[PDB]
Design a protein around this ligand. Sequence first.
Ligand SMILES: *[C@@H]1O[C@H](CO)[C@@H](O[C@@H]2O[C@H](CO)[C@@H](O[C@@H]3O[C@H](CO)[C@@H](O)[C@H](O)[C@@H]3O)[C@H](O)[C@H]2NC(C)=O)[C@H](O)[C@H]1NC(C)=O
Ligand SMILES: Nc1ncnc2c1ncn2[C@@H]1O[C@H](COP(=O)(O)OP(=O)(O)OP(=O)(O)O)[C@@H](O)[C@H]1O
Ligand SMILES: [Ca+2]
Ligand SMILES: [Ca+2]
Ligand SMILES: [Mg+2]
Lengths: 260, 29, 371
Amino acid sequence: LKIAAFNIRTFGETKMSNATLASYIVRIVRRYDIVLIQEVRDSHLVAVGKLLDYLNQDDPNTYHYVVSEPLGRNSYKERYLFLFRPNKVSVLDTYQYDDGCESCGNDSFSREPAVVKFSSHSTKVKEFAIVALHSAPSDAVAEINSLYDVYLDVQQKWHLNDVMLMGDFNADCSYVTSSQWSSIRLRTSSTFQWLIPDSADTTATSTNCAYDRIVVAGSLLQSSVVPGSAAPFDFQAAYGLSNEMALAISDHYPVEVTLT
Amino acid sequence: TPQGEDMLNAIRRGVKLKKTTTNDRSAPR
Amino acid sequence: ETTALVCDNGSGLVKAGFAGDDAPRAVFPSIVGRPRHQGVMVGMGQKDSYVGDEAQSKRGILTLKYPIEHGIITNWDDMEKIWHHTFYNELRVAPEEHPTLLTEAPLNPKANREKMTQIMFETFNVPAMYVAIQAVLSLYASGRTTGIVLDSGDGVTHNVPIYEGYALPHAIMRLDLAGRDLTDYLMKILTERGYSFVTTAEREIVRDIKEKLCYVALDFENEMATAASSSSLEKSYELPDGQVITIGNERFRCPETLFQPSFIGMESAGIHETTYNSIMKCDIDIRKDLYANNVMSGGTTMYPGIADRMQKEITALAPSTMKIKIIAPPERKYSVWIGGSILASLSTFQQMWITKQEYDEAGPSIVHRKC
Ligand SMILES: *[C@@H]1O[C@H](CO)[C@@H](O[C@@H]2O[C@H](CO)[C@@H](O[C@@H]3O[C@H](CO)[C@@H](O)[C@H](O)[C@@H]3O)[C@H](O)[C@H]2NC(C)=O)[C@H](O)[C@H]1NC(C)=O
Ligand SMILES: Nc1ncnc2c1ncn2[C@@H]1O[C@H](COP(=O)(O)OP(=O)(O)OP(=O)(O)O)[C@@H](O)[C@H]1O
Ligand SMILES: [Ca+2]
Ligand SMILES: [Ca+2]
Ligand SMILES: [Mg+2]
């Protein structure tokens, strides 16, 4: 059971119209039984809709989806998109982090994280959740720190300890320095294992940065993890691309993990 | 016309409707 | 307390409200959407269907159906959906609790008028209902009971003459052309100049160009010349990505299509001609009233300076010394609704409704008589 999180730069109608670019996205998506796609800039769900058309044009139920309304504090907006294989996992319940009120989501999160109760009969973990974040770069320290409150909430609502937390956290280089790791309860706490290391390069550009992350809490979900299966997916090499091509797919690599 | 001429006069002479706001959703996103 | 309902349903937009307001409570696109793929929005469970305004906003993961064509209802099971949503979600009322006035296309096949009735009384169990012809109500909205109306909405344009409050069937004119078309051409011609209008959000941007930049030329030639010489009746409009662009003669070529269907290759007379054709097809005696009583209604009748062109058009086709008068009330976007609300609120009209018993003991036909 492979799980992945993938920031797809300005993913929208323009990207999906382009067929080269669409074959590759599909080639990457088909790798996974659960993939979170971020930076969905699709005002009427036409890009989303186009992709599912490709994934389900043969067997109708290859994938099912979870999607958010567009989120952002101000006018620039994007959505979280979850595709999963229904035949290996199902969704028990989903919700959006509301910080404990109607309009509190944006009191600490520019893009209010989406939470998903997946049911997996193939792995050691039977039920577990995934929390999705694409932080505000200028506020990564606080936002990531705030994922800790989100974990407490997931325990409170679902009485679940087994939680994968992931997304483009902007968790490196300019945006989170070494000294700042101590300001993030998610990292200093013993409850969480950080599966993608700090020395990892999750960017398709010539920067070396550990921005995209995968974090796990709870014995059953921790035990399920295949050691050395957490890692970035370098599609440029994988597919033998030129930089320009890789670049025009996204400026991030998916982060993946395998569960048993 | 079933009770018509009378009704015809009510329309010409006029009627004053009152204010309700409206969420007209014909703006093109 | 126990208030009547007013629901004007068009090709593109539904206009719903209470009898007595000025003032539709709800204006939303007339579309039903169904999920193309299996899945949910966050916090939410599976959806069978999206109606009205969530239909358009989630278009891309749906297959849409537009139940009203050219003004007439053609899919009955989607239209129930559209009314249900209108009743319970949009107004938040119980149908059995409210008399409901519905509106109707000009030259509505009798058969349709009957379905509407059976569904309202049967699916919705309404206590009282009535059907009124759209043009006839927008004419009332102006405060007359005799006159000529030009309906131009989203999919259809009508010329309907009225005497005594009677629509005069035999003389109606129907141009299979309206806004949706007008938008289309304006897309085609902007894509000609070297512009990209591919995305749903882009194909919706063009629609606001129409509503903000477009006027009708009183004289088309002068106007073509004015734009080619002085080169400064161009305006501008800020696209979503910071990018603004300049708009020129395209502004008034678009609306002109109405007078010249030939721009999209239609062997139909323009609107000035079809309005004339309408009048000199009525009883000779009442035509005087008709010239001095042209009332304008519909979305596509909102172009700054359309009335003026109509004013200075028919003069040419009218007898040399005729009194041409053209009324286009500012609220004419919803002139039809406004008139329905008027009709259904006036304590004198209270009798003209259809009762529950009356539908049961008579049939679905009671409506050809009392309406
Ligand atoms: C879909 O997206 C792809 C990837 O961005 C676009 O392909 C790229 O853009 C153009 C296509 O004409 C290429 O530029 C060319 O460069 C070569 C240099 O060897 C030159 O010989 C050509 O005359 C032209 O200037 C570019 O190489 C190409 N591939 C990349 C950057 O990987 C494609 O245009 C997009 N459009 C579609 C098909 O919708
Ligand atoms: N300011 C404006 N300028 C030009 N056109 C406009 C303006 N406002 C609305 N419209 C047009 O009016 C049309 C909608 O009109 P309306 O809602 O009356 O049609 P409808 O009643 O839904 O359908 P129909 O009347 O054709 O059955 C749209 O095509 C829209 O572009
Ligand atoms: Ca890199
Ligand atoms: Ca209409
Ligand atoms: Mg590093």
